[PDB]
């Protein structure tokens, strides 16, 4: 658990919605620094199932071309973590939301030798929202991040932040 930072009293229902990733970081340069790095992704929108499972649109760029993706974050007992189904087991964690402007969140690889870690900094409208970067990097400040980017609101209303 390198993440020590989760929202209480998360309401999942209320993250429903459109999102953009307004700002990325990781914890090393090779996450997210070409377009096609693995966890370089794009949020589109939030969608929580009734049960409260987190079903996630998001656009990554793949072979040359930026690809439309679906996942499906599972609920864990801990209302403010899922758990995404891959190879490696990835805990998503929600750090802050004031579920009307901004959302933070991680993903961390469960075990890794120096386990790799990526957040964002999700707003709801493209607009460059200084407080929510402020929120944002706070949260951040100990995480041992190596990359970060962010995205001017042209680059947010393009496919993969063109
Ligand atoms: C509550 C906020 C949740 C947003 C979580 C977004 C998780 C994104 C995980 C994407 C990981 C890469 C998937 C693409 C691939 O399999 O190549
Ligand atoms: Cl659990």
Redesign the pocket.
């Known amino acids: 658990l390198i993440v020590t930072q989760t929202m209480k009293g998360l309401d999942i229902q209320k ?1 429903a919605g459109t999102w953009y990733s307004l700002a990325m970081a990781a914890s090393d340069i090779s996450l997210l620094d070409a377009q096609s790095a ?2 370089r ?1 794009y ?1 589109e929108e ?1 969608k929580p199932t009734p049960e409260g499972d ?1 079903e ?1 649109l ?1 656009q ?1 760029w793949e072979n040359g071309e930026c690809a439309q ?1 679906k ?1 499906i ?1 599972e609920k864990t007992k801990i209302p403010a973590v899922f758990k ?1 189904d ?1 190879l490696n087991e ?1 805990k ?1 964690l ?1 750090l802050d939301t004031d579920y009307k402007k901004y ?1 933070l ?1 991680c ?1 961390e690889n469960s075990a890794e030798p120096e386990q790799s870690l990526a957040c964002q900094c ?1 707003v709801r409208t493209p607009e460059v929202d200084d407080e929510a970067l402020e929120k944002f990097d706070k949260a951040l400040k100990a995480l041992p991040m190596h990359i970060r980017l962010s995205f001017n609101p042209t680059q947010l209303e393009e496919q993969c932040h063109i």
């Open positions: 993250v693995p966890l992704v949020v939030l987190l996630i998001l990554k993706k996942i974050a995404i891959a990835n998503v929600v959302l969140f993903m999700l």
